[PDB]
Every structure is written in C-alpha cells, then in structure tokens.
Design a protein around this ligand. Structure first.
Ligand code: HG
Ligand code: HG
Lengths: 322, 322
C-alpha cells in the first residue's frame, strides 16, 4: 500500500476519468442513495459518489489505505458522508443494505488478483434490485501472429544451450527454460494488424454472477480466420460497462483504444498453428483459480481443416512485461 | 526460483567471471577440500569449486532450484563431487565440517535481503582456520550533487500537493508522500563527476563477524569536501574481496569500475545541504534490521562548520529502479 502505487492508478486518466464520468453522468443513481465502496485502489472513488450527491458512503477498505482514505475524508470535509471501515468485505460487518456497490476490481485479463470475487461477495450487502459499478465485464480474445515475439522466447532460452558457459554445460535445462518462458503471459500492447480473426467475447454479468463462477470460468471459441498465416497464440483484453439509469458508460482496454495500465495480454502457443483465410480455429480457454491469487490458463486450439493441435498452459502469476 | 532470474545473475559477466577468477586462481584453497555452497544465487558456484578440484561440495539450495542444480550436476558428470542438499543452512545437516564456504550473499548496498546472516550462520559448519569466499565486504559512501534527480523526485511527490484532483483535495497527504518518495533509494549508475568527496569505507569481515550483529550496523562518516555546492545526498556502493591463499580478488561495484546488475545506490536528502570546499560533512548511517527481509536506514548528516543538519529515514524494502 504505497502512495506511489495509488498515484500510478490515479494517473491512468482512462481509468480515473471513466469511473468519474460514469458516476456523475448517472447522478440519479447516487443522489441521496446509500453506496458501498469495496474497491478503490485509486482511493478516490468514494469522493466521486459524494460529488454525485450520495447520502452515506460505507468504504472498505484495505489495511493501508484505510488510514490514507481517513485523512482525505477529514481534509475534504466529508466525515459525515463517508465512513472508512478497515479490512475486507468477507471479514467486516455493515449496518445497512446499500443501493449501489462501486469498485475497481479489474486485474490483467480482468480476473488477475481475483478481486472480483470479493466484489461479487459484496452482494450480501446489496438491496434487492440495486446495481453495481461496473455492471458487466466483457473479456475479449483473438488469435494473433507475431514472429518476433515467438522467436524472442527461443533466443532467451537458447542461453541455456551452451556446452561450456564458464566451463559448465547448461543444455540439460534448455527445455525447462523454454517451458518456463512460454508459461508467462506477455503484458504489452500491439498494432491491430497482428490480429488474425475477429475477437470472440465472454461476458460476466456482475449483477447475476455468483463468486464461485470465477473459480473455473471456461471460454470456448471458434475463430473464422480473416488472414492467412501462423497463429502464435491468443491475444486478450477487456471492457467493463457502467449501466446506470441515465447512461451506460464503457471502460475499454481494447488495442483499438487509448492505452491504459492494463495494456493487453498475449498467451503464446508452444507450437504455432498454420491457418488459412476461411479456415476455422477452434478450441477452449480454461482459467483455473490457483493458490497464488491468480489463474492457471489452459489453452487448447486446433485448425479444423488440417487437424493440427496445441496444447498450452500458462500461469498469470508470473507475467512477462513487454 | 525461476530460471531467467538465475539467467539474469549469470549474464552479469563481471560477477560470474570474477567469482570464477577468485576460485580458480586460488585453487590450493579448493584442491581436495570440502566445500559448502550456500548461496546459491546462480547454481554455478559449485561447478567452479569442482573445476578447482574440490573433493566434495555440499550445495544447500532452496526448493525448487535444488532440482535445476541436480539436473546440471548429473549432466556435467559431477555426481561424485557435488552433493545437492535441499533446504536452508539453519535447517539442514552436513555429514562433515568444511574447509571453505562459498556464496553470493550480496544485495543492493551489500546488506539488502539479509542473505549475509545465512552466510555467517554457515560458519557453524566451518573447520577452524577455514576460509570464506568472499572474505570481507567494503561499503563505500560518498556525498553527491545531482540537481536533476532531486527535483525529479520532489515533483513526483508534488502530485500529492493538489487542492483539486478530480475535485479531491490530496494536500493533506503531501508529507506522507514526500516521506515515502525520499525514503526509497535510487538504484542507478552515475558519472563520478557528481561525487563531491573521496569515499569513506566501512568494512564487514565475514570470517570474524557473528550473525548477531548484522542487525544493527552503524556506519560513521567524515568527508572532506573538495568542491563547494549543494549535497543532494549520499551515494553507496560495495567492494567484496576473496582473500585466498595465492591472491586476493576484488569484485567491485564502484562507479569507476565496469557496471554490474547491482548498479549503485543513493539516499537523497529531503533537503540538500550546502557545503564549501574544505568543510567537513560528518554523521552516521544506521541500518536497523526489520521483519522480514530488509533494513530501516537512518542517515544523520551535518556540516561541521555551520552546522546545517539532515536526518532521513530510508527504507530498503522498495526501492526506485532508474
Ligand atoms: Hg476505496
Ligand atoms: Hg544511504
């Protein structure tokens, strides 16, 4: 819980701006309503709800951060509208059902850090027919070609393919190194020209979802290739929508959108799949929740026409940055 | 413990070449001797001991890097000379007392990550009149002038002096922020032109030092000023020596020597001190250990002739890269 971290999140104008934009333009959803702020991370969220004219804002509240919020609430003259309860939703108690829940629970590929579970858990404190900001989450995935990124892996791992690095033969660990390097999802951004087919969408309606739904989360796909080339993996990004009474407002991390701190995520295939235009690449992406507040990512994919296959396991716990 | 981190360590050619130089050039220290590799940092140290002709090399390594070390031992046909023992030194048992202990226990400012405490605890397995590689550690410090780095930090902290960020007053958290930003040391290299006095030296002898004992570490300094102007902070770096039987080999981290993955480190004061050529800048650097794996550092500085004071609490558990 560093202020540096909190600053970095505040600096993301798309994040902070869109959140604020969504709350103020949907004024009638906040005017004299009771709100719960479970997320933050920018720490600025319960203030937006005050600016939209909320009656009471219960704000929990991670052990840092509880104190950071406490100072700003006092200094912004809002002690009588915003209460700061240190801790976490599955650990604390609220004295009142709320109209709206607000939070910033999105990680890399939306689900990383598993904060949405705590978010969905908060619906124990939600009044019937109340809503949540954000309301839904659209995960997008599409196949990509990128020779330079694929090759990059082997140039790295080939360091181990030396028989006499300072008189030591490292070659027996080359295979383990390749596996490891391919096991990391790549966080950075790309030109859309590397996208081989139109993206499929997978939608989580936060208003109806139970927190158990986020433990397995299976995403099937049947891409219809626009371009001829080699598929090196699947690209991932996400959108969330703030569906209010007045207006639905979108926060998008698409590669066609201005850059955010979430960038985009690419999961490579260990064996590239050749596909033609008009060919269908099908398979499923499986995200298993793991013990390190992250996901084990399983990707199986085949080119229907040729029957070539892979067969790929990632751990979002150890992402490669760029 | 990822291959890759290990690969990063290895690719530091100064570090790897110097460790080999130290061992091979002091072969009479290893020839037919019993060695303890406690690092291990990069699995590679045991192999140097093996190249030097050690009779038996026990290598205490963590889990999982114990596996990766074993693979290399078998594939390099050294299974009769290198014995991997999984776990930690303050846990495991050795069938024998050892002639030499070898390790890579250095972090930033030398002491970071408190690996040295494991290193000195290994003296348990050391024969009387045994040796350690490295034998001693020299911490150098020098006052520096760097106008650009100072205001660069201050203007980042300056974010938190803001009466209306999306309608929110952050002003009250300035000072918590400034404290945080100036607590983090700057890991960077620099031109030696910025050095405002010849360095002073603090020696920690590993052969005699008790794990006690590296929990406090009081470093006094008394610089002769050489150049007039503003002292923006203190620069720190470490030399480490392998005092073998044939010759002493130094691994230097100094800004005058080729670059290493350790770079150099700087505490910048929250407020620069003015000093003239001929003046004395005296004071102490305190390194109070903490739970879990880092130091709380108290830098007390004054110009004798004035005497303008500075006291700053710097926290290693960050820091600021570049
Ligand atoms: Hg918050
Ligand atoms: Hg320092």
């Amino acid at each position: 819980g560093y202020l540096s971290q909190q600053q970095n999140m505040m600096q993301d104008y798309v994040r902070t701006g869109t959140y604020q934009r969504a709350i103020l333009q949907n004024h009638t959803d906040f005017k004299d309503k009771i709100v719960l702020d479970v997320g933050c991370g920018s720490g600025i969220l319960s203030f937006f709800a005050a600016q939209a004219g909320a009656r009471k804002i219960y704000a929990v509240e991670a052990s840092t951060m509880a104190q950071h919020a406490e100072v700003l609430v006092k200094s912004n003259n809002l002690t009588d509208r915003i209460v700061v309860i240190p801790g976490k939703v599955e650990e604390v108690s609220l004295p009142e059902q709320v109209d709206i829940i607000i939070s910033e629970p999105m990680g890399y590929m939306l689900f990383n850090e598993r904060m949405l579970e705590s978010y969905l858990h908060a619906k124990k404190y939600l009044k019937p027919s109340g809503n949540m900001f954000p309301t839904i989450g659209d995960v997008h995935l599409a196949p990509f070609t990128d020779e330079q990124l694929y090759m990059e892996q082997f140039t790295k791992a080939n360091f181990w393919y030396q028989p006499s690095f300072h008189g030591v033969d490292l070659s027996a660990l080359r295979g383990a190194a390749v596996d490891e390097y391919f096991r990391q999802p790549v966080v950075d951004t790309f030109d859309i020209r590397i996208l081989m087919a139109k993206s499929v969408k997978y939608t989580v309606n936060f208003l109806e979802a139970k927190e158990g739904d986020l433990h397995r989360i299976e995403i099937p796909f049947k891409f219809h290739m626009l371009h001829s080339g080699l598929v090196h993996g699947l690209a991932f990004w996400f959108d969330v929508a703030f569906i209010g009474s007045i207006m639905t407002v979108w926060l998008s991390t698409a590669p066609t959108e201005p850059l955010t701190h979430w960038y985009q995520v690419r999961c490579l295939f260990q064996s590239p799949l050749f596909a033609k235009a008009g060919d269908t690449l099908s398979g499923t992406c499986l995200l298993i929740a793991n013990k390190r507040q992250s996901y084990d990512i399983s990707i199986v994919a085949q080119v229907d026409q040729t029957g070539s296959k892979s067969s790929n396991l990632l751990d979002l716990k150890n992402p490669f940055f760029r």
